């Protein structure tokens, strides 16, 4: 498969024009992205919105003007010529016939497969407010590529200045433990019991995680040999805890010297 890398400038810029148009839940915003789709890692360095209009009672009604897209491509050649149209994004959680049929419309001006994006305006759950989806002609199915967030040296720190240890790092561990619990229980209970969907295609991938207390009890005897490195870490740390007494004993000379000067 391929990979997706989107800078944080593109993600937040897509959310701004959503509120600036006073778009409610009955309407959704659609836009296009720019970058280099030739390599295996899709990078999105730019984004632009579009005047998308849709009826809430009909999924077959949409408004898409390619003349604004043709003009947008001509306006970008005077700014950044290295950028080409790699696909298109859209807002809203729901996927209806409006966004599914237009995927072939952007294909005329896009050499690669248009990369579909769902931008969550409320940012509900985990990370990644925007998900990168790709479609296949062979049956069509929406698959998510390993979308990541990365930018340049000045772009990553630039948002840090605008926004501005061991126990805190362990807090995110428990959040990932409940992610394993809540994702499997809610999904597996939907396939079983009432309303069996067509499946056993996905089940092969699900049980592929469980084979390799989720992993292996056969290494329990060998685990004690793997735990030895943990016991070794306590060998030096016992002296490291005593190494704090080195400075603790040296600092005793300071206060003892203060009693002499006093």
């Amino acid at each position: 498969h391929e990979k997706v890398t989107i800078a944080p400038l593109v993600l937040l810029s897509a959310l701004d024009h959503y509120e600036r148009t006073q778009t409610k839940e009955n309407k959704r915003c659609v836009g296009v992205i720019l970058g280099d789709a030739n390599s295996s890692t899709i990078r999105v360095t730019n984004s632009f919105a579009l005047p998308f209009e849709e009826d809430e009672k009909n999924s077959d009604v949409w408004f898409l003007d390619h003349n604004y897209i043709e003009n947008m491509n001509e306006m970008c050649k005077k700014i950044n010529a290295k950028e080409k149209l790699i696909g298109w994004y859209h807002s809203g959680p729901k996927l209806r016939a409006s966004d599914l049929k237009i995927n072939e419309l952007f294909k005329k001006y896009t050499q690669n497969n248009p990369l579909l994006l769902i931008v969550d305006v409320k940012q509900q759950g985990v990370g990644l407010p925007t998900d990168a989806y790709v479609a296949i002609e062979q049956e069509k199915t929406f698959l998510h590529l390993p979308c990541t967030i990365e930018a340049e040296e000045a772009e990553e720190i630039g948002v840090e200045h605008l926004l501005r240890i061991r126990l805190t790092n362990q807090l995110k561990s428990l959040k990932g433990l409940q992610s394993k619990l809540k994702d499997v229980v809610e999904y597996l209970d939907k396939v079983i019991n009432k309303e069996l969907p067509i499946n056993h295609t996905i089940l092969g991938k699900l049980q592929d995680v469980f084979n390799l207390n989720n992993l292996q009890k056969a290494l329990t005897v060998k685990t004690n040999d793997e735990l030895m490195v943990i016991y070794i870490s306590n060998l030096v740390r016992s002296i490291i805890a005593f190494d704090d007494l080195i400075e603790n004993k040296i600092q005793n000379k300071k206060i003892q010297e203060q009693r002499v000067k006093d």
Binding site: Q170, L171, L188
Partner: protein, 190 residues
């Protein structure tokens, strides 16, 4: 899986299923004869006139009797030993996948030559050389132990069957339920 493409009559579906049946007789690849059950193949044919060979081999894997299927076939496919060799492989592949998650709830990975002997209806000498043939074909990865009479094999290839591992996937998460309390409260107290 494609309904609109390849539109043929009812009589041609049985001839197409006949080619699908004889193709899976000589190889174990791509699941087993039970793969065509969920696909619109075995349900579109008739259970008589030697079109039930796909259904007879479904229960023949658990029963492990070659004489039942050999009496319902002709001399064409019964004169080749490859049919009997690869049929016994699918019978073992079901048992080889019982080492991780099938029956045992504790996910303890163990297999003995005595358990596979009763499943494949073979003595202890034939099952030792039979496991090597299944590993050499690229089915599963692992080794065996002749000294302690043990077989250690992992699980790789998924199957089409369901309902055996459904209860355990939730039961393995029950052990995660009891782990939310002790480390959840003590970490927030720090």
């Amino acid at each position: 899986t494609l309904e609109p493409s390849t539109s043929i009559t009812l009589a041609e579906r049985q001839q197409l299923a006949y080619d699908l049946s004889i193709s899976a007789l000589l190889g174990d690849k791509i699941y087993n004869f039970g793969e065509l059950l969920h696909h619109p193949i075995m349900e579109t044919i008739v259970n008589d006139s030697n079109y039930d060979w796909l259904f007879q081999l479904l229960n023949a894997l658990t029963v492990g009797d070659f004489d039942k299927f050999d009496s319902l076939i002709k001399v064409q496919i019964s004169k080749i030993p490859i049919l009997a060799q690869h049929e016994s492989f699918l019978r073992q592949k079901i048992c080889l996948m019982t080492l991780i998650e099938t029956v045992f709830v504790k996910n303890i990975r163990m297999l003995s030559f005595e358990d596979i002997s009763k499943a494949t209806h073979l003595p202890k000498d034939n099952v030792e050389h039979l496991v090597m043939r299944a590993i050499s074909l690229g089915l599963l990865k692992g080794s065996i132990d002749q000294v302690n009479e043990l077989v250690t094999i992992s699980w790789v290839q998924p199957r089409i069957i369901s309902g055996d591992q459904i209860t355990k996937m939730k039961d393995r998460l029950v052990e995660w339920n009891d782990q939310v309390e002790k480390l959840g409260k003590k970490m927030e107290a720090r």
